[PDB]
Amino acid sequence: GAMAGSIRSKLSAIDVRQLGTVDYRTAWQLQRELADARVAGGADTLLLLEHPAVYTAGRRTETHERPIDGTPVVDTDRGGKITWHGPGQLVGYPIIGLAEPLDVVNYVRRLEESLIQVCADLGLHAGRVDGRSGVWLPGRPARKVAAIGVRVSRATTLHGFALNCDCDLAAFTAIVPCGISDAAVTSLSAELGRTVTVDEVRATVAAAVCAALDGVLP
């Protein structure tokens, strides 16, 4: 099915870089540098990092979705509307050459599957809500544990995902996150009733992403 096989143009090992806390702009610059290196024939890369607290807005963000307290926002070129990154949220930036003709939806679906599996491996039952990319726990309201916002340029991916581990969720209350006003944002820690850190899930996230891209998630 759609998840089988590989989305990649080259079957070489992904270079996984476990970074620390990296300013949003600095990381964005590195993403672009790595993407150019990939087009020049270099490796596929997966950056895993945390950002200092920041709101970011893709082009589709609407004015009323911005912080109700006037907090500044970084405009960014990924898909999606507004989100927040900060301590305790694991941000992943897969910088991957995709096979052409492109299937960006399938790429997003593979990132979702990777994070669904990470949740499953912790004993949680997460999945998709069609039309609302990312990873959700069912409920009324439904609870979003991971966000996705990507862009593909020159058949190479940019941006990625963000998995809420033990971050303070209060930042999400000041915005309309990803254009959604009828739901909620959660974290692994809130769902499991214990602190689940970024560092505890770094390795399993890396493994899951790399497996999903090549169709070999368990």
Ligand SMILES: *[C@@H](CCCCCCC)CC(=O)O
């Ligand atoms: C809202 C934005 C989520 C961006 C996540 C970026 C992770 C690096 C998505 C939407 O509007 O659908």
